[PDB]
Coordinates of C-alpha atoms and ligand atoms in Angstrom, one line a residue:
X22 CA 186.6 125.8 79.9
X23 CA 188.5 128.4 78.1
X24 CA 187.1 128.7 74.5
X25 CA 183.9 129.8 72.7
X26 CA 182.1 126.9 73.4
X27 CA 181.4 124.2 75.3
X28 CA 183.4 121.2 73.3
X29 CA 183.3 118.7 76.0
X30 CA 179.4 118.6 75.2
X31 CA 179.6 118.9 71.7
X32 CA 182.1 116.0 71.9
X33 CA 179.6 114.0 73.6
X34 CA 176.5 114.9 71.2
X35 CA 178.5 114.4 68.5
X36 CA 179.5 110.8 69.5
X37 CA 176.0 109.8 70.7
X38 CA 174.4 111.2 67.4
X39 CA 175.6 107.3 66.6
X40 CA 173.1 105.5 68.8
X41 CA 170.7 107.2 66.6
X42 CA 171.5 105.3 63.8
X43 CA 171.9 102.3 65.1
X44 CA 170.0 98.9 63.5
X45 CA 169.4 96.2 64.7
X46 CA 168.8 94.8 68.0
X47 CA 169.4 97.2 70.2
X48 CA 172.3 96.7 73.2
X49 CA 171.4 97.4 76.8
X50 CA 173.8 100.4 76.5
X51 CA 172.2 102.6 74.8
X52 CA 171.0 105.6 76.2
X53 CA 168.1 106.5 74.5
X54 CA 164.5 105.1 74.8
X55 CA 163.0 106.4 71.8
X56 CA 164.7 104.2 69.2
X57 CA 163.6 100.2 69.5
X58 CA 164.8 97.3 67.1
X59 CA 164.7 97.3 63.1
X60 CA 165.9 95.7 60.8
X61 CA 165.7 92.5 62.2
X62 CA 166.1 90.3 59.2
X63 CA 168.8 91.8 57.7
X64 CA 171.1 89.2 55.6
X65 CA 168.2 86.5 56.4
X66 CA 167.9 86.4 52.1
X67 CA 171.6 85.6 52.1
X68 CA 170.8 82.9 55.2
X69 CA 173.2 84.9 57.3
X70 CA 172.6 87.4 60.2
X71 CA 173.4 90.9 59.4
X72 CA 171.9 92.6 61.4
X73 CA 173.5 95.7 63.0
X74 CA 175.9 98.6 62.1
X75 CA 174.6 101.9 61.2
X76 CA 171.6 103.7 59.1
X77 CA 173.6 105.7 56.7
X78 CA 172.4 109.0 56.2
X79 CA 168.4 110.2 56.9
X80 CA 167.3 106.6 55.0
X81 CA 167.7 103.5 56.4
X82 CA 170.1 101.9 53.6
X83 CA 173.3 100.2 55.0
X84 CA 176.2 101.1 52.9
X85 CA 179.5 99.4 53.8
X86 CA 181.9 102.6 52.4
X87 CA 180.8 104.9 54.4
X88 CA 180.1 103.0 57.2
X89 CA 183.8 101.6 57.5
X90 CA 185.4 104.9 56.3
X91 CA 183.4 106.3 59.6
X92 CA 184.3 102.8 61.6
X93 CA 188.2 104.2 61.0
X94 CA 188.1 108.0 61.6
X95 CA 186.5 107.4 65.0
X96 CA 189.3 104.6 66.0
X97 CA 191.6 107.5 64.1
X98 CA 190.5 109.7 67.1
X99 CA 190.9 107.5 69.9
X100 CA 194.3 107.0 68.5
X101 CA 195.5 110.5 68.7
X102 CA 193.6 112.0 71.7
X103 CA 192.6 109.0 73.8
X104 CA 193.7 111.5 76.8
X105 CA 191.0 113.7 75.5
X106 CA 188.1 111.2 75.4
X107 CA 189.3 109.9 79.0
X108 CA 188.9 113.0 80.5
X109 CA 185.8 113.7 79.0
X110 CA 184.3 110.7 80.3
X111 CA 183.5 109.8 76.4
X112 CA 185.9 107.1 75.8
X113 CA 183.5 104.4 77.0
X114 CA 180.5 105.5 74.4
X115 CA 183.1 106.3 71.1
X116 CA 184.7 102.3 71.5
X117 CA 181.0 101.3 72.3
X118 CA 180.4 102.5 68.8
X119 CA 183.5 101.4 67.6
X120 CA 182.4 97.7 68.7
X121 CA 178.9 98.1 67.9
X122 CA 180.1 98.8 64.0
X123 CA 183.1 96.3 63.6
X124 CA 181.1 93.9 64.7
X125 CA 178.9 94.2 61.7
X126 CA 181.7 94.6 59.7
X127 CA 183.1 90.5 60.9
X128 CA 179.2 89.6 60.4
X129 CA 179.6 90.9 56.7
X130 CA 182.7 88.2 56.4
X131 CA 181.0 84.8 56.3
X132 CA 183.4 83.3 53.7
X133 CA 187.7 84.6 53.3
X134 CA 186.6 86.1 49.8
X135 CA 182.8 86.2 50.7
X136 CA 182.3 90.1 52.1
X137 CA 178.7 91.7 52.2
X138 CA 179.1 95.3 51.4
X139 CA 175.2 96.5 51.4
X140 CA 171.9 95.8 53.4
X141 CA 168.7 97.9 51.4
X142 CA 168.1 98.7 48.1
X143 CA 168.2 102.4 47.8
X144 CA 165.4 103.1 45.7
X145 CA 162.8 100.8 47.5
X146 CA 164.6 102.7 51.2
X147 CA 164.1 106.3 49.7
X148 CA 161.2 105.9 48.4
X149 CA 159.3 105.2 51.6
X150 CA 159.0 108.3 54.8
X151 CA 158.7 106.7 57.8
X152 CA 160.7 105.7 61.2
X153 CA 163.3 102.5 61.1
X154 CA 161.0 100.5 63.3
X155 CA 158.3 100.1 61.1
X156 CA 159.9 99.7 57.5
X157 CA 157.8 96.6 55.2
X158 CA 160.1 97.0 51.9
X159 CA 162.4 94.5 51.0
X160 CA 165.7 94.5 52.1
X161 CA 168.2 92.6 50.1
X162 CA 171.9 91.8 51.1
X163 CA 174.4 92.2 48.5
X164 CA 177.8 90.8 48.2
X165 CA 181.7 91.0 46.1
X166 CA 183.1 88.3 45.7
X167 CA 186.9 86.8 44.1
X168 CA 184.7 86.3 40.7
X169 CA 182.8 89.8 41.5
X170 CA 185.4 92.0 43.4
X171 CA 185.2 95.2 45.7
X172 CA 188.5 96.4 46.6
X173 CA 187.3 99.7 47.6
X174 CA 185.1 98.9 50.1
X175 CA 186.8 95.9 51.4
X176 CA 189.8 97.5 52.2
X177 CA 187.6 100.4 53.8
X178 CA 186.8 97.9 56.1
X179 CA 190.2 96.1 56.5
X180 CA 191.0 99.7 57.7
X181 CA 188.7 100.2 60.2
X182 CA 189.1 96.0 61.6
X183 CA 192.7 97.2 62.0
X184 CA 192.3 100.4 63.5
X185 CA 189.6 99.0 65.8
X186 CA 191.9 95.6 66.4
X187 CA 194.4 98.8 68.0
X188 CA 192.1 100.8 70.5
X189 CA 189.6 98.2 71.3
X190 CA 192.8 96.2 72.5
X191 CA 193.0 97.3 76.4
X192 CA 189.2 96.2 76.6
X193 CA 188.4 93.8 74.7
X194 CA 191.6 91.8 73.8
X195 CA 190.0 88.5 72.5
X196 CA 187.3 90.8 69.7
X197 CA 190.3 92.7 69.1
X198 CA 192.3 89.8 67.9
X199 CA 189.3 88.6 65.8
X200 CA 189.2 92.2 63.8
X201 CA 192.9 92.0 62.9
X202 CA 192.5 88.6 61.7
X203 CA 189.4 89.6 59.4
X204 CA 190.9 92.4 58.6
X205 CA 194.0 90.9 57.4
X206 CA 191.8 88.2 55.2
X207 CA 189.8 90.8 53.9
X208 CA 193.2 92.9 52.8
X209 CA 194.2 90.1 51.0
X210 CA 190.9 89.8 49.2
X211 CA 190.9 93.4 48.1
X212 CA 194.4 93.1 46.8
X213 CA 194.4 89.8 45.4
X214 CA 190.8 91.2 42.9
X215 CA 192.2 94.9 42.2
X216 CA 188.9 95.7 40.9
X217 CA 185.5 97.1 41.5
X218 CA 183.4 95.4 39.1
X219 CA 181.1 93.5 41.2
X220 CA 180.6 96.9 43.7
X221 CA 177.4 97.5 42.1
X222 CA 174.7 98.3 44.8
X223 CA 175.6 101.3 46.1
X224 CA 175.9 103.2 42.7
X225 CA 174.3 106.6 42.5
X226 CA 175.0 106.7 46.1
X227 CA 178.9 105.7 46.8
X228 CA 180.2 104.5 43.4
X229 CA 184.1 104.3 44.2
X230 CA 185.3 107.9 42.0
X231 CA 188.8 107.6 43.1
X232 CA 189.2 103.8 42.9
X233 CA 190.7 101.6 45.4
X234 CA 194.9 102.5 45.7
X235 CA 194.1 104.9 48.3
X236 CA 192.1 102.4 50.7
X237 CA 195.1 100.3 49.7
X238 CA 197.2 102.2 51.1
X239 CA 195.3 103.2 53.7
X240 CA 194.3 99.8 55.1
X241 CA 198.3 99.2 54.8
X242 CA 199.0 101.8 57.0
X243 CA 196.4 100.4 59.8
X244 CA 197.6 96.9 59.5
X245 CA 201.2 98.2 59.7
X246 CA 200.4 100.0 62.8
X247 CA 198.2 96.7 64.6
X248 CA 200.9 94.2 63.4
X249 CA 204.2 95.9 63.5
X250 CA 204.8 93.7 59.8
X251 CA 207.0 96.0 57.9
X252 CA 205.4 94.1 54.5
X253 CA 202.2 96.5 55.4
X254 CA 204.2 99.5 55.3
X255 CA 205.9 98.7 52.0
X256 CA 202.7 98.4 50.3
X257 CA 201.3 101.2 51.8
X258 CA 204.2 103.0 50.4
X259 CA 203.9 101.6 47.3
X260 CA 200.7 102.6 46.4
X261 CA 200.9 106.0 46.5
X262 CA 202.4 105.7 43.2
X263 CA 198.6 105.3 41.8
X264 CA 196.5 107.5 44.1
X265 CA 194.4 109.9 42.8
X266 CA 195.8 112.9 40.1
X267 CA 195.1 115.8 39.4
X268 CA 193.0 114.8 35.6
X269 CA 196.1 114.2 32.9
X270 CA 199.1 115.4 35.2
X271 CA 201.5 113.0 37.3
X272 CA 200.4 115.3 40.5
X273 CA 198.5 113.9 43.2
X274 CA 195.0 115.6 43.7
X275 CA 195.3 118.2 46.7
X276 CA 192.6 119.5 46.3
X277 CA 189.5 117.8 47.6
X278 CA 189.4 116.4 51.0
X279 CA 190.3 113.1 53.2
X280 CA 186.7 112.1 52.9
X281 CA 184.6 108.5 52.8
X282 CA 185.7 108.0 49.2
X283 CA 189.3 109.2 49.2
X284 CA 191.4 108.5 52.1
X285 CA 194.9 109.2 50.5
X286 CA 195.4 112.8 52.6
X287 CA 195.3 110.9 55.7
X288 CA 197.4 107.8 54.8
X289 CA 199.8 110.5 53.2
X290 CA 199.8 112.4 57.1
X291 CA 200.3 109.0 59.1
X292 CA 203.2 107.7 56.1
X293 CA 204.6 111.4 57.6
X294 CA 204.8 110.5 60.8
X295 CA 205.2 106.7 60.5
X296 CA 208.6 107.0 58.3
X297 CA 209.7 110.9 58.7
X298 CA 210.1 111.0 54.6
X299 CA 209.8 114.4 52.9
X300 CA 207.7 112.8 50.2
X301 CA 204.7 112.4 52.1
X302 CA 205.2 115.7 53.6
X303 CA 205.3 117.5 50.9
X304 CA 201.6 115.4 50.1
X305 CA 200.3 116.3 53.0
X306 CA 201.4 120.2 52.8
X307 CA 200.3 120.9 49.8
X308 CA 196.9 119.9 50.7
X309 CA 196.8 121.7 54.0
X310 CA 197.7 124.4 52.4
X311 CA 195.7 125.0 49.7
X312 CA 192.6 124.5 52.5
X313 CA 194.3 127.6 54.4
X314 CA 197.3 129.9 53.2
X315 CA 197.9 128.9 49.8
X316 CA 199.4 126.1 47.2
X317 CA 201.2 127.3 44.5
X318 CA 199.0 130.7 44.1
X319 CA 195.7 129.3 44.7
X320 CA 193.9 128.6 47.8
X321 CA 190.2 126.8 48.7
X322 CA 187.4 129.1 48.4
X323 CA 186.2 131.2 51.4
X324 CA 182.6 131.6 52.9
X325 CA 182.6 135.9 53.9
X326 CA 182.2 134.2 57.5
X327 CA 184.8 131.9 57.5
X328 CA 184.1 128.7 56.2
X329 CA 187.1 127.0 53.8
X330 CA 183.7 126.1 51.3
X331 CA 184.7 122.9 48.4
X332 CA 181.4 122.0 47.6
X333 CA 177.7 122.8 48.0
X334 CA 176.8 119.2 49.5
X335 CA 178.3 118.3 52.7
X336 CA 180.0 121.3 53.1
X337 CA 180.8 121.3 56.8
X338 CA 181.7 117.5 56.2
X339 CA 184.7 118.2 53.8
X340 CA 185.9 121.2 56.3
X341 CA 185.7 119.3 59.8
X342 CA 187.4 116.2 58.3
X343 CA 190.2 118.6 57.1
X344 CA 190.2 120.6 60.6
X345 CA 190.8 116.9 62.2
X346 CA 194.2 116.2 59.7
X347 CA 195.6 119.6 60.6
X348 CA 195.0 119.1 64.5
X349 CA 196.7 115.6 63.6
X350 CA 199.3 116.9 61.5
X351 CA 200.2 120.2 63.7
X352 CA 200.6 118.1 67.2
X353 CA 203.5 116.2 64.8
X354 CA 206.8 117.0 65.8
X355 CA 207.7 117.1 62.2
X356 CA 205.7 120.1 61.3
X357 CA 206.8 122.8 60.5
X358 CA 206.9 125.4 63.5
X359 CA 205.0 128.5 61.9
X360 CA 202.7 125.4 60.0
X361 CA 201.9 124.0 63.0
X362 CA 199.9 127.4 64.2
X363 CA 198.4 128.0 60.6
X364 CA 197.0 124.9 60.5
X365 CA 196.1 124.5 64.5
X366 CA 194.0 128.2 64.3
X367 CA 192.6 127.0 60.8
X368 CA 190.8 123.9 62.3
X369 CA 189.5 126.1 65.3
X370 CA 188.3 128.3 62.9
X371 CA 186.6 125.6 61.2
X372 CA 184.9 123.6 64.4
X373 CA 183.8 126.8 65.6
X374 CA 182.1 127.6 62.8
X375 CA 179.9 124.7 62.9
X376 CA 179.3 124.8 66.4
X377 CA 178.3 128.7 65.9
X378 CA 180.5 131.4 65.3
X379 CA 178.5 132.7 62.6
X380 CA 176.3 133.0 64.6
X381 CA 173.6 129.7 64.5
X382 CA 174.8 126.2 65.0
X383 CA 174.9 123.3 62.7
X384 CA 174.8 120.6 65.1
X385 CA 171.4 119.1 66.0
X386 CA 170.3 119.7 69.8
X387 CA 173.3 122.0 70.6
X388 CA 174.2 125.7 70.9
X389 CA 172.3 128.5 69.1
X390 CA 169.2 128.2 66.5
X391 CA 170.5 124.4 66.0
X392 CA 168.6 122.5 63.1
X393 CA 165.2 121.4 64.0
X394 CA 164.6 119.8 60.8
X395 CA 167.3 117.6 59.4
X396 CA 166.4 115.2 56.5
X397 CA 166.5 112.1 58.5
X398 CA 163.2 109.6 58.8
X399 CA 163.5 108.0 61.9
X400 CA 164.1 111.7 64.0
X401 CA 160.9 112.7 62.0
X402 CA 158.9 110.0 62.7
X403 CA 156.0 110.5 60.5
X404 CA 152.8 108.2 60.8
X405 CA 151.5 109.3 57.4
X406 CA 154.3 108.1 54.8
X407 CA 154.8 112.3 54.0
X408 CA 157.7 114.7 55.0
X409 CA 154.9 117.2 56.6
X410 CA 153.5 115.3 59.2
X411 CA 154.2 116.1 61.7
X412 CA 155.2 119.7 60.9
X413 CA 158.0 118.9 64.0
X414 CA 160.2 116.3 64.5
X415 CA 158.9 114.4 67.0
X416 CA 163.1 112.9 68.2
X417 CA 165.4 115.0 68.6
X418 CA 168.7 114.0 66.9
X419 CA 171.6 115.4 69.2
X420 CA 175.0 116.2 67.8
X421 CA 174.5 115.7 64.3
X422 CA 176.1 118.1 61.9
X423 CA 174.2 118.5 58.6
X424 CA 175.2 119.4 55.4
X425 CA 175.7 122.7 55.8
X426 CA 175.0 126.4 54.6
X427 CA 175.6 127.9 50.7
X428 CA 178.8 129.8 49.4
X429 CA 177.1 132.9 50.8
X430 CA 176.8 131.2 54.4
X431 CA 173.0 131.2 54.3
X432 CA 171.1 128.1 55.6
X433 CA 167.4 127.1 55.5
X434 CA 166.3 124.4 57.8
X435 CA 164.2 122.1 55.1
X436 CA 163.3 118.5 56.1
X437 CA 162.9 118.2 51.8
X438 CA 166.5 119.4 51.5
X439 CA 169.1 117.0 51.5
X440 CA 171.6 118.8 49.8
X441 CA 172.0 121.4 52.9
X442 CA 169.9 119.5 55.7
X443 CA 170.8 115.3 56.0
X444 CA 173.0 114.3 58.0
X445 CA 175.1 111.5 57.9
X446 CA 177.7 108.6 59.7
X447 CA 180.7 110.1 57.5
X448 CA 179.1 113.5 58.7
X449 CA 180.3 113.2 62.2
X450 CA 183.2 111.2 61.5
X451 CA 186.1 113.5 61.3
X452 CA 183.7 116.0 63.2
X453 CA 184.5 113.8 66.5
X454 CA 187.9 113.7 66.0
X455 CA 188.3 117.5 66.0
X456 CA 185.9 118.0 68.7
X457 CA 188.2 116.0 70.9
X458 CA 191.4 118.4 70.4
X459 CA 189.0 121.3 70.8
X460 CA 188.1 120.1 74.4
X461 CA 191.8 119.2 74.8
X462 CA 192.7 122.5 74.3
X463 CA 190.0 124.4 75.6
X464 CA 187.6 122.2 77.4
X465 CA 184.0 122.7 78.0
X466 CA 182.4 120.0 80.5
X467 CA 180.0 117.4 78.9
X468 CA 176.3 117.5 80.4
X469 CA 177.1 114.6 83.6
X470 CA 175.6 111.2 82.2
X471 CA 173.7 113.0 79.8
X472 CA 170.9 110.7 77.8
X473 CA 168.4 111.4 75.2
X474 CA 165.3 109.9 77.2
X475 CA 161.7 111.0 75.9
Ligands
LIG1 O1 186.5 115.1 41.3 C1 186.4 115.8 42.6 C2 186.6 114.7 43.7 O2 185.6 113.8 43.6 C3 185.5 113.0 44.7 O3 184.3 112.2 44.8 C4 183.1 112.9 45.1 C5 182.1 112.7 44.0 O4 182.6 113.4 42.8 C6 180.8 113.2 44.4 O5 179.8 113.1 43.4 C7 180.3 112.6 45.7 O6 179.1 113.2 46.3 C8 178.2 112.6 47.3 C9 178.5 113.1 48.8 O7 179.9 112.9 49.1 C10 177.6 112.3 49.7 O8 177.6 112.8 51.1 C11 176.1 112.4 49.3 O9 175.1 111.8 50.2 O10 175.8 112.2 48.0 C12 176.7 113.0 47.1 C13 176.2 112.9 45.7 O11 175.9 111.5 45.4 O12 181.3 112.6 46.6 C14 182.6 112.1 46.3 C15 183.5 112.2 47.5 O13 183.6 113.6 47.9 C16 186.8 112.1 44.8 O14 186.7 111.3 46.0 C17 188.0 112.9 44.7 O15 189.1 112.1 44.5 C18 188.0 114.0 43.6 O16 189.1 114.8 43.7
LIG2 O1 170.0 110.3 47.0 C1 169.8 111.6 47.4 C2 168.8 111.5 48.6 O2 167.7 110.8 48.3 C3 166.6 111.0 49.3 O3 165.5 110.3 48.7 C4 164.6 111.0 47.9 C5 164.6 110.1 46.6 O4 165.8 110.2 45.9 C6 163.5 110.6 45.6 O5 163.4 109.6 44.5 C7 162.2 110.7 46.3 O6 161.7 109.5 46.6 O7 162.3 111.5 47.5 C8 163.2 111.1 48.5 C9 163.0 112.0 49.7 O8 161.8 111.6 50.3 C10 167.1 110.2 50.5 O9 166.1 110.4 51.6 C11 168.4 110.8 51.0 O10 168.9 109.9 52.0 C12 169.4 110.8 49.8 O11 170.6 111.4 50.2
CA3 CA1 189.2 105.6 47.0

């Protein structure tokens, strides 16, 4: 332990924040005892068992884009800093989740060009305020098909199949196989449709804004690196011809973030380090750069206390996601020497800035004045169908990062605000990934076999 937290625990909350949101039947390892089985008929009005996965947000939809995109930033992690997660003791509980949501993932592929993409109708979900366990809405399954396509999401989740198919590999060899496989066919499917026409459920919630060339080539670079078939690489490649621009220019938008709908910065950094060319470099820099020192004049906007701030929901989201690609893209050989230490110090800046440095923490159950009232049903637990009682959450939902704070760095703690206060799979996503350089760099001991037992 040498830095300003303790990032071996955060590592570990942040990770187990997951069990929480788990649906289904539950497996005997999880830790907790205050979360039982739900959503036990899921798929059952599609004759089909789809059960599983994860709660997205606070509700209790299951929405497949977010899900997957999550499914392949935490196998991203384990890629890069396996060592990290090993000597953390945290390697065992990130590829239980890993399993636990690629297995849903297969379940959601009952036909080649069959793939169900959404469990919950989000206005029947939302408009109930109660725990998982107890929900007595409908639940309907929805599906894209080759006559009603999805390319976005099901290349999201040919990406995390692939990615899973690569760290899952040492122990579990046979699943393994069976993810590539799926996620090969369900590659295919995406490419063969082009199209989001029959991706219909989840709008208002995760409509595909950037459209589907980015999962393409996303996806691409995951099969490449699970197969070794230089055809994945070339269309990977390819695509980056039609990711998203910057509105009626021919230059590639650097200026959001890697995030559950757009996934181009990170297929940009790995087509860096996968082929050496300065193309994708000079993708990848220009987006890095406008987060920290500067792009062409103009730079992200700036909390006073630190925090590179692009957008008012999900703030701390968009920042940790981007701290992860610079950790990823610093420890590259490629790099740039004086780069590597902007962008290394700009994603401490940005971890510790959830975890506290402003002084309060972000993260559920860890640290300083940590958020006791995150938008999120099942933590709540109310009896009464009503966001005020009980006035306390009854669960306490460890290592979840919410939203985040306003331009200005204030923060309420609102169970009614969902803007500031949910939390969310995609959330924690990148989160994990930069937790795990933090405690490779500076450590911080997890809390020995820590559990959330009530
Ligand atoms: O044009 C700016 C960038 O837009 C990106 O899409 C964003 C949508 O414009 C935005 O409405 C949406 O917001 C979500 C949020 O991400 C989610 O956590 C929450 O629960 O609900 C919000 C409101 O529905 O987010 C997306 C993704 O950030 C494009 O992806 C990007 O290409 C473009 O530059
Ligand atoms: O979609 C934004 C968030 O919706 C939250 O649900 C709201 C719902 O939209 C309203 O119609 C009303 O019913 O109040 C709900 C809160 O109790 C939902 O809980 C969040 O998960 C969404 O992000
Ligand atoms: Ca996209």
């Amino acid at each position: 332990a040498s830095g300003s937290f303790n990032y071996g625990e955060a590592l570990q909350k942040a990770i187990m924040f997951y069990e929480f949101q788990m649906s289904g039947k539950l497996p005997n390892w999880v830790r907790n005892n205050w979360r039982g089985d739900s959503a036990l008929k899921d798929g059952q009005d599609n004759g089909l068992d789809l059960t599983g996965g994860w709660f997205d947000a606070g509700d209790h939809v299951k929405f497949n884009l977010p899900m997957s995109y999550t499914g392949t930033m935490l196998s991203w992690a384990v890629y890069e800093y396996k060592d990290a997660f090993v000597k953390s003791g945290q390697l065992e509980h990130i590829l239980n989740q890993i399993e636990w949501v690629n297995d849903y993932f297969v379940k959601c592929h009952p036909s080649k060009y069959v793939y169900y993409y959404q469990v919950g109708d989000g206005s029947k979900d939302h408009a109930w305020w109660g725990p998982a366990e107890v929900m007595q809405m409908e639940r309907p399954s929805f599906k894209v098909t080759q006559s009603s396509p999805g390319s976005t999401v099901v290349a999201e989740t040919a990406a995390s199949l692939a990615a899973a198919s690569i760290v899952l590999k040492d122990r579990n060899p046979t699943k393994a196989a069976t993810y590539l496989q799926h996620a090969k066919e369900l590659y295919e499917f995406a490419e063969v449709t082009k199209s989001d026409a029959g991706y219909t459920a989840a709008n208002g919630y995760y409509n595909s804004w950037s459209g589907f060339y980015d999962e393409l080539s996303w996806a691409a670079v995951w099969l490449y690196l699970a197969t070794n078939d230089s055809t994945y690489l070339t269309k990977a490649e390819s695509y980056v011809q039609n990711w998203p621009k910057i509105s009626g220019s021919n230059t590639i938008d650097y200026k959001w973030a890697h995030c559950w709908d757009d996934v181009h910065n990170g297929a940009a950094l790995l087509l860096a380090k996968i082929t050496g060319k300065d193309i994708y470099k000079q993708i990848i820099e220009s987006h890095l750069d406008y987060w920290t020192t500067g792009y062409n004049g103009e730079r992200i906007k700036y909390t006073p206390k630190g925090l590179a701030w692009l957008d008012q929901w999900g703030s701390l989201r968009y920042a940790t996601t981007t701290a992860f690609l610079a950790f990823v893209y610093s420890d590259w050989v490629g790099c740039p020497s004086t780069k590597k230490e902007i962008y290394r110090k700009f994603g401490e800046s940005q971890i510790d800035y959830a975890l506290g440095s402003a002084g309060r923490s972000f993260v559920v159950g860890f640290g300083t004045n940590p958020p006791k009232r995150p938008h999120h049903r099942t933590a709540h637990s109310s009896w009464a169908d009503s966001q005020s009682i009980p006035s306390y959450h009854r669960h306490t939902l460890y290592g979840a990062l919410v939203g985040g704070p306003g331009s200005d760095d204030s923060y309420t703690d609102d169970i009614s605000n969902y803007v500031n206060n949910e939390v969310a799979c995609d959330y924690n996503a990148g989160f994990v990934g930069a937790l795990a350089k933090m405690y490779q760099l500076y450590g911080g001991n997890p809390i020995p076999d820590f559990k959330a037992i009530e």
